[PDB]
Amino acid sequence: KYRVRKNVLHLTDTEKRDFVRTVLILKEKGIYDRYIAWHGAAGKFHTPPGSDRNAAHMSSAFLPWHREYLLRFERDLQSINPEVTLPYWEWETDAQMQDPSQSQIWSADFMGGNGNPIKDFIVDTGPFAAGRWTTIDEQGNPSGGLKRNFGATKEAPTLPTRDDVLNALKITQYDTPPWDMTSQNSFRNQLEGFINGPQLHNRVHRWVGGQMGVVPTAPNDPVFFLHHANVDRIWAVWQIIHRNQNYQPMKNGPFGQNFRDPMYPWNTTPEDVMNHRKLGYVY
Amino acid sequence: KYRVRKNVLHLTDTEKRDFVRTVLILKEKGIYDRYIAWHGAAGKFHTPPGSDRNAAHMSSAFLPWHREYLLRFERDLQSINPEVTLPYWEWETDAQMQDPSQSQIWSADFMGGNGNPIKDFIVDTGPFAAGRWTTIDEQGNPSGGLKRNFGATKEAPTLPTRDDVLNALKITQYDTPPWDMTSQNSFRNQLEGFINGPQLHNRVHRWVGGQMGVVPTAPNDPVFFLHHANVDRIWAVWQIIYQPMKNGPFGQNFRDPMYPWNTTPEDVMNHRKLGYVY
């Protein structure tokens, strides 16, 4: 409970500077790429084979899978600069803004802006604009530049609200059988956003568009980690509020989705990361 | 230097029943599938992006990546039955047989035989025959049927030889830049089989055919591990009789991690320290 992950809106210019710097270094080093691949690889690991469920989404392990993912990313960042921690994007507040693209999270000194429709929605502002930042497709090959198209779809014209975050936090069960895209009264499936979707998480990916718009390639965009830090935070909060509640399923769910099963592509299990304070950080 | 990997031809009837038994349990548990995914996932991680190399093939990390891979698979086996270790298929000796498909490895109590051509070459005998063993396509989805087609191609109608092996063993340099398909005087590249390819490792895959014919789906066939065990052996010897140490593409150096894991080549340079010998 010593490294503290802050709200992006509360970062000092030098904090934003250092975060960007380090991710750039993590990118130059070839480490960042490992994270894009792990994500694409997990999505292709169906539990069980022939099912929608994959090691990282559309099932119970969604939350702990990405919590582990962020933990690893933060440690790698820390290896570069121990002063740096993963901030979180509180999109539910930006959603209150008239035009969310006005959020400081999209300023030229942090995440960069919306895509340029003159250049096929290629983002040309900020540290990650094309020419400074390389991207790779689902196949693992060069794709040619980050892309964004903020709220351009009929399905997700808006970012998720506070009420949405507050309504989800009211769910009494972590997840419910069958442990998938259809699970009812499920805080997990609710946060993932499949209920009358896209909501919350799925809705954020949809809103941003570009590579964030497709799960397998989402990580090419640094904001991805900031978005998942927010999701991880909302889950930490649920855990605090429901202390008699715990992870599910505990057993008899498909391999890779139970409390003590390994989470592909790793050996780490949901139990291993159930307690986030134990992981060394807080919000 | 205590778990001992035996020649598949030196295995007893019970040791083979146990091995098979153990493999079917892994598949059963859902653990086996992790392996097919990891190998597949690796082929899509290029070092660097835009190049011909991937985390596990066509580059220096080819050998270290599969040794680690095999080390893990074996451990998962041990977990099920601590008596079971990973056997190896000495294909250079079967290359001498008039008809290698008669090799005991292909018996109905161990790996089953070459696919039945009338059934689209789907393996119809052995423990892993269609209906007894599920395979997964490249998309990670279900494909139904283990296939094999022994020596069916023009470029690979025969298994590598003792000489081919002996000649590989002669190579002095572990690997040479550019650290890829085109490396000359490279033990890594010779054994992988790109020199005058398809040879040795590359040749075995081409020979067996079926899922083994294509790298991404290769692990659906239990022999994959048996075959790679022999490769680790051939390398084990070379090491008795690494490069690039630095400056080669990230993911290939002596101290870089081997995607999708954190383990580095160094970590597995000395196989004995890993707890096994051949």
Ligand SMILES: [Cu+2]
């Ligand atoms: Cu994800």
Ligand SMILES: [Cu+2]
């Ligand atoms: Cu391979």
